[PDB]
Chain A
Amino acid sequence: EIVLTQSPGTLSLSPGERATLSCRASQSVSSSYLAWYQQKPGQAPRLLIYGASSRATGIPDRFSGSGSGTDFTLTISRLEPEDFAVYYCQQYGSSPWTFGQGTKVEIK
């Protein structure tokens, strides 16, 4: 369960972002109960996606994700190159709810 995986490590990019970020684990677990969050330098870790293909009433458009079950994916197809923070995966599903490796996004 505990060993989650996020391949892109510390991705390096620039403005004009079509970036994406994916989540795997050491185990096959649920699908409806996993999420990705956004954390800036000193900000409260905000909400991005609860469940792969999902959004909230206020979470920004051009924001999406996909996958299920075994493996998970996210992206933000277009974006104003404003902020490039750390992104955190977290399954909760069945106990023990736990948090992902965390992948950063910057600008060259």
Chain B
Amino acid sequence: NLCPFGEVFNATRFASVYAWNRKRISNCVADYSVLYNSASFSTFKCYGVSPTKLNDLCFTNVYADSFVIRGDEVRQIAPGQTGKIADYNYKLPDDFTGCVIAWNSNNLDSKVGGNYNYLYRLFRKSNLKPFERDISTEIYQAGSTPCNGVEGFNCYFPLQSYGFQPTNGVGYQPYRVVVLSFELLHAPATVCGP
């Protein structure tokens, strides 16, 4: 019964911002000491009681998410924090209880060119509801004229990507993100991390 976080940051095909991935961490336990304290991370925004004590408490259930984000775009990585992400890609749960273990991998998850490994959202009916995703590639209908499902004036393909490459500056540099909803449910509560 050993489930390392390896499998998550080893997901070298890190999912796109909107098209994040999941792993229902349940009925498993593993020790995450070195990569949580001795980690080379940056902007360890992990909420909860603290960055620690999670490797000391059992978990009700744990859910994993991966984001591939522009460098300082982290500003928008918070529920109720507005921006061109919450409006379009992932407005975090208004009362987000899980946490964030994001950090810059300029080498990892980016290579020279217009990297095709990540995509995000630009145009929507309205602000995306918290804690969900959009798969749609339907065009951006908002207003008077119809557009018969082709891109054009006031109807654009809503998923444009900043396919950056490692050469950028920190704000435009690559940034891995992972979001870990340590959610809390009833009698089935089968995760621990000592």
Contact = CB atoms under 8 A, between A and B. Distances in A.
A touches B (Cβ under 8 A): yes
Interface residues of B, number: 5
A94 B151 CA distance: 8
Chain A binding surface SS class: loop
Interface size classification for chain A: under 10
Interface string A36-59: 000000000000000100000000
A93 interface: yes
Interface in A77-99: 92-94
B146 A32 contact: yes
B152 interface: yes
A32 B145 contact: yes
A68 to B, nearest CB: 14
Nearest to A51: B145
Nearest to B146: A32
A37 to B, nearest CB: 15
A33 B150 CA distance: 13
A33 B144 CA distance: 12
Nearest to A50: B145
A90 B174 CA distance: 42
Contacts of A92: 152-153
A23 B150 CA distance: 24
Contacts of A32: 145-146
